């Protein structure tokens, strides 16, 4: 269960395929509206190796749908997120997450 709303469309023809890493600037927020994670504060692109499941499932399968240069808003359910165990001291248990993902480039 994931919902993706476009904030600003990008290309729409180059989609993230297996073999090339995906380079993003995301901004994760809790459902109450309290930001918990971002990449622009660290001021470094978050390059994650798509297909190897090293990131959370919701982010992984929501990044596939959106294309290059697209600012997209996600909504990851706890099932596709950390769930009942949650993240210790960061994310409360059984929480729905929202991500302001932007894939500025594929490598």
């Amino acid at each position: 269960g994931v919902e993706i709303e476009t904030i600003s469309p990008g290309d729409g023809r180059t989609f993230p395929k297996k073999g090339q890493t995906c380079v993003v600037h995301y901004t994760g927020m809790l459902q109450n509206g309290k930001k918990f994670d971002s990449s622009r504060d660290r001021n470094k692109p978050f390059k994650f190796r798509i297909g190897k499941q090293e990131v959370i499932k919701g982010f992984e399968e929501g990044a596939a749908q959106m294309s290059l240069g697209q600012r997209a808003k996600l909504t990851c359910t706890p099932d596709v997120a950390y769930g009942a165990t949650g993240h210790p001291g960061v994310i409360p248990p059984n929480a729905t997450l929202i991500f302001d993902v932007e894939l500025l480039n594929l490598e």
């Binding site: 809790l30 109450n32 309290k34 949650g86 993240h87 210790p88 001291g89 960061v90 994310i91 409360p92």
Partner: protein
Amino acid sequence: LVYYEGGAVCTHARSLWRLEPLRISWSGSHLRWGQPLRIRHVTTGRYLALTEDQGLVVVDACKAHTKATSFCFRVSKEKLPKRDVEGMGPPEIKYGESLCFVQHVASGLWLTYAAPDPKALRLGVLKKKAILHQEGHMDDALFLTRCQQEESQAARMIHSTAGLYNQFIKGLDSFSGKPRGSGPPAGPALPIEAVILSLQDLIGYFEPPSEELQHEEKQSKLRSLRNRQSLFQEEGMLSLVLNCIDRLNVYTTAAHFAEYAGEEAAESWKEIVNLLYELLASLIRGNRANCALFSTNLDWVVSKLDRLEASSGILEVLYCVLIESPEVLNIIQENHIKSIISLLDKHGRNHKVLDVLCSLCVCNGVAVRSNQDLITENLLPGRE
């Protein structure tokens, strides 16, 4: 039962005897060998005696008929009361020298450690019971050593204080049930004014020294404070006050106390529970030993953290325990962490709670990652 006990036992208050002669006037005259005098244990208020059914014991002052309780000090063991002198007397017995033999004057017997030693004393410490032997052994001579005025005064304070709180306790549980309604109280009136005054006296007795004092004077006052606190705990005053909080805590509000003891006792309920918490904090503040005593019943203080009549007092008690004893920290569980955090949620933004939380992570430069994980698990992710 009297013993020739050893070790650190007779740096406490239980080994202090007061030489009480048979003469009122000139009762502090210089001791002369072989003159009658009683023996009194200051902290218990009992006199050395030769009873018929248990030999050499300590008897209450109500039944010291001066025959079984008189004693004499003698330089040698040969068989020997003189005429009183209206003056300072002749200086005969010295402190730290002049080996004395204590002989009961009415019976002629001699004090001696008991020879038999059972299975308990086979491995345990030899608590040699004192028996007033008919002739006595050879090395049973005694030195006499003075105790400082601080210790003697303190010792008398426990003996008076114990009686005043034991009497308070008995009055308290006398009306444990039996709702008064609209009539008179259950029995004798509670010594409320006496207890309140005694608490305010002990709180000032145990007040921590000021920071402006010079380091040399300050440390000596620390020694005086630690010694007095340890003497009180070792004599059981700390347990007695713990019972006092236990008895008082069963009633939720002052009106609820009024329904069981009277309307006149309702006004002093809040004051007398605050004073008890302040006394407990002063009795335990800075002592590793006294703070360690809460490691067994740590839930007793944590469970009271939600009471509103005295919230700062119990919080101060908890803070004093945690800042001093690391062994208390290892007893801390998720129940306690979720209880302390609830105080932040219920009693407002009290920074002293954050001080308690800070003290729960590191104690004496050693981290406790179990407590660190529980705190960051329960406090941080909620963001509320």
